[PDB]
Ligand binder design. Structure first.
Ligand SMILES: O=C(O)CC[C@H](C(=O)O)[C@@H](O)C(=O)O
Ligand SMILES: O=C(O)CC[C@H](C(=O)O)[C@@H](O)C(=O)O
Ligand SMILES: [Mn+2]
Ligand SMILES: [Mn+2]
Lengths: 329, 329
């Protein structure tokens, strides 16, 4: 079997992960799911958002499936569950796919996931505060390789977004991205972070594999979600060398917790990316979602009157259909 | 008289500045304009993009009016004309107003203009590249004061955009922004840089005075231009303690240089901000622009068949009308 660690978190996390897990269970019985707590509650007890013993099991697992965690600004000493898991598990590539569910068109973003302004070197001293945007040869080389694999697989190109005129680290990063994409026969268009925002809202589908430094990726990937029903359908994967973690790009939405109306699509499509990573069949889930969405009642965030459970049940419906065929004939 | 230094630059710079200067001359005869070269041509000769002698006159001038300069990525040692002028003249506040010309609704952005990732400390050493995002008490205090004056004058509030969870310097910056806006009775809503991008494209007009660190401001202010005809109509001012500089937010658009079809509105509205700064009457220019735009033929970037000259002539038309009245009756 495959061992998958599951961290539902809080807010709508549990609800959408219930949805995703149930969809996964409907496409394969080859995955054992083990659940773990994490977040503020665990921080309160042990001073970390994930227990050391739980963290050890998690890294021995084959993949991780993650919901959403509330990160409060007013909790001294708290570090993000997801940032913690990203660093602890070596998760250097963050892939976000923003889908137009009708057409199957995709905005594909590769966000470097381990350095940049997230590296963690920061200080206040004598009324001067500082943060160090770090780019390393190792960080840039592997995030570039990863982006070229995505471009190769899609018979596509890379759009490297930066601000090289102002940032030494982006001049560096750009040169390395160009080296490795040369070696591998991939085109690299470049784009400046400010003007690209305009291009991203106006001409969404013409950018291939978008690549960028961590914080720029964080910004651009939220921005790209405007081209989808709601941020509620957008999935992602965080990849490292021996393990990966999958989470919807939405967050806790505590406002709507427990009201039975959260959108499980993003988590479901994330369980899809998880199956791909394991060598199982995520294309099934994707087809199920496309198909349910033609005439299915959608959740309120997408302008519909449907409940979470209705959407889950409906997608499982489409799966059972595709599944009961022999490759589709 | 007022002495105004004018730096048309290259590309469409000269064309739109010709437009702006002609509009200024139609509302006041109290401004003497002196022209100066700057950019790559001057860099080629003297190794700086502005001559030291020219720079000295410029700082003795009352204000500066600036077009657009091409900053090529492949010119070793070249620093931006505008970045150079920003640092040399002490221009710490950058105000960008994105207007909906029909309604007179405005997205108002205050971009800190002297530090952050623009401070200039960067290095490559041993396959590690670095840039230092610097926030100082002095930088944050004065950019906050400036933002509160804009909120006070509009009977409005501040939206401070940041990524405090990840950036020490934003935790600092946020506390100082909150201090000074408390002292002055201004509300401070806050927003996270990633999720705010969604809010900015979806709910543009409900954010009051948006305030942020330099690079974040650079990004957000380009993004905000999607809510306007084209980036072509958007103006700005760069303010310091003894002088200010005004430029359209668009750039060189060399693609369309010399073709007689550039949009002079952004420069014109920037000449408006310049008149306000001098205590002259920029509201005139703004009314002229609103009025011309009701039925006037617009330039191709706004979906029309008009030439630069037509729009300039038309706005001067509206000015002459408003001007020939006694405060409007
Ligand atoms: O809880 C946090 O501060 C992390 C949020 C996290 C990030 O990458 O910054 C989230 O914004 C995301 O895009 O994954
Ligand atoms: O020529 C340059 O690199 C400066 C461009 C300048 C900036 O603030 O980065 C421009 O993008 C702007 O928004 O003013
Ligand atoms: Mn984010
Ligand atoms: Mn810019």
């Amino acid at each position: 079997m495959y061992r998958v660690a599951v961290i539902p978190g809080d807010g709508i996390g549990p609800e959408v992960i219930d949805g995703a897990v149930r969809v996964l269970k409907a496409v394969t019985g080859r995955v054992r799911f083990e659940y773990y707590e994490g977040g503020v509650d665990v921080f309160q007890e042990c001073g970390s958002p994930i227990r050391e013993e739980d963290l050890e099991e998690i890294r021995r697992s084959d993949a991780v499936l993650f919901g959403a965690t509330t990160t409060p600004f007013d909790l001294p000493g708290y570090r993000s569950l997801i940032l913690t898991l990203r660093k602890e598990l070596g998760l250097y590539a963050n892939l976000r796919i923003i889908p137009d569910l009708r057409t199957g068109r995709e905005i594909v973003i590769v966000r470097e996931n381990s350095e940049g302004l997230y590296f963690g070197i920061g200080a206040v001293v004598n009324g001067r505060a500082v943060d160090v945007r770090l780019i390393t040869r190792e960080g840039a080389e592997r995030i570039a390789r990863f982006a070229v694999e995505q471009a190769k697989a899609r018979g596509s190109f890379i759009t490297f977004v930066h601000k090289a005129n102002v940032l030494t680290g982006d001049k560096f990063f750009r040169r390395i991205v160009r080296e490795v994409a040369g070696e591998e026969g991939v085109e690299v268009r470049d784009a400046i972070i400010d003007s690209f925002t305009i291009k991203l809202v106006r001409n969404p589908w013409e950018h291939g594999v978008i690549l960028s430094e961590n914080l720029f990726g964080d910004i651009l990937s939220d921005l790209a979600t405007v081209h989808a029903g709601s941020i509620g359908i957008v999935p992602s994967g965080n990849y490292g060398d021996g393990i990966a973690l999958f989470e919807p790009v939405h967050g806790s939405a505590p406002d709507i917790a427990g009201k039975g109306i959260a959108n499980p699509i993003g988590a479901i499509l994330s369980g899809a990316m998880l199956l791909d990573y394991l060598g199982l069949d995520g294309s099934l889930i994707r087809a199920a979602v496309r198909g349910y969405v033609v005439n299915g009642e959608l959740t309120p965030d997408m302008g519909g009157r449907a409940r979470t459970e209705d959407v889950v049940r409906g997608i499982i419906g489409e799966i059972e259909d595709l599944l009961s065929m022999d490759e589709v004939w």
